[PDB]
C-alpha cells in the first residue's frame, strides 16, 4: 500500500489477484430488509422488546433457548427460506464466482441468501450454520429443514417424533463448535491472494480472527459502515477501507472492475424468478 479501491480493482483486472476469499456478516443482508444486531435503531440491540429478549445474544444461547425457545423460533420463522431475497451485494458475490475469482465465501449469516443467489454449496462456508437442517436436542436425530417447517410457520415449537425432544435447526449457538467445513480455512486462507470483508462487526470468534490468517502481502478490503476488528487496531500496509453503505461500496468496485451492465442483467434475471 497504501492502496486505494482503484488499486485493488486494477490488481483484479491485471489478473495479479486470482483467488479471492470473502468474509461476510449481517450488514450485507440489511438492504434485503433483514435487521442485523449493531445498526443504530433497526439492529436487535435496539429492538429487544419485539423478540422478548434480555439482550440480543440470548437468542443464540442454549440456556436461554431451553428456558424459552419461542424468541428463537420467531426469528426462525422470519428467516426460513422464501421470505427475504438476496440484494445486489449477494449477486456481486455470485458474479465473482461466475467470473472464476471466488476461492471461498465464509459467512456468519444464517439467512441462506448466498445459496439462494446461486453460489454452489462447495464455494460456501456457512460458519454459523443453516436452517436447511435440524437436530433433536435430546436424541441427536437429524431432520431436513422442511420436516419442521409447518410447526415453525404455525408458531409451534417443533418436537422429535422419536423422543419428543425440542428439534433445533442447525444454527451454531454460543459455545458450540463451528461446522466441520469451517476447517477449510486451514487451506483456504494461505492460498488467498485477496481478502474481501463485507458488512460485519468482527465481534464473534473464531470467525473474526480469520482476517489475520491471510499472508502479510495480501490486501484486505473492508466494505462496511465503519472500521472494525483486527483491521481497526491491527492495521497492515495493504488494508483498504471503503466506508459507507455496503451496496454503494460494492457498486463503486463493480464499476472500477468493468462489471456494471453484467451485474445489472444478472440481478434482473435472478430476482425476477420466484
Amino acid at each position: 500500500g497504501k492502496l486505494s479501491l482503484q488499486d485493488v480493482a486494477e490488481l483484479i483486472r491485471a489478473r495479479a489477484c486470482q483467488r479471492v476469499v470473502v468474509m461476510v456478516g449481517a450488514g450485507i443482508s440489511t438492504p434485503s430488509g433483514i435487521p442485523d444486531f449493531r445498526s443504530p435503531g433497526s439492529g436487535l440491540y435496539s429492538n429487544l422488546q419485539q423478540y422478548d429478549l434480555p439482550y440480543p445474544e440470548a437468542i443464540f444461547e442454549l440456556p436461554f433457548f431451553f428456558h424459552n425457545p419461542k424468541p428463537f423460533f420467531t426469528l426462525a420463522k422470519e428467516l426460513y427460506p422464501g421470505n427475504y431475497k438476496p440484494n445486489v451485494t449477494h449477486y456481486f458475490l455470485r458474479l465473482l464466482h461466475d467470473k472464476g475469482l471466488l476461492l471461498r465465501l465464509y459467512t456468519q449469516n444464517i439467512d441462506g441468501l448466498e445459496r439462494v443467489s446461486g453460489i454452489p454449496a462447495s464455494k460456501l462456508v456457512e460458519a454459523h450454520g443453516t436452517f436447511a437442517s435440524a437436530t433433536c436436542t435430546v436424541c441427536q436425530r437429524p431432520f431436513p429443514g422442511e420436516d419442521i417447517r409447518a410447526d415453525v410457520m404455525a408458531d409451534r415449537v417443533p418436537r422429535c417424533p422419536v423422543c419428543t425432544g425440542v428439534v433445533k435447526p442447525d444454527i451454531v449457538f454460543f459455545g458450540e463448535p463451528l461446522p466441520q467445513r469451517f476447517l477449510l480455512h486451514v487451506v483456504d486462507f494461505p492460498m488467498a491472494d485477496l481478502l474481501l470483508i463485507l458488512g460485519t462487526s468482527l465481534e464473534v470468534e473464531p470467525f473474526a480472527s480469520l482476517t489475520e490468517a491471510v499472508r502479510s502481502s495480501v490486501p484486505r478490503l473492508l466494505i462496511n459502515r465503519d472500521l472494525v476488528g483486527p483491521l481497526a487496531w491491527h492495521p497492515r500496509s495493504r488494508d483498504v477501507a471503503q466506508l459507507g453503505d455496503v451496496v454503494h461500496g460494492v457498486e463503486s468496485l463493480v464499476e472500477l472492475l468493468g462489471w456494471t451492465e453484467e451485474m445489472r442483467d444478472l440481478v434482473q434475471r435472478e430476482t425476477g424468478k420466484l
Partner: peptide
C-alpha cells in the same frame, strides 16, 4: 471453536 463473543 466454540463460538464465543468478542
Amino acid at each position: 471453536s466454540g463460538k464465543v463473543m468478542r
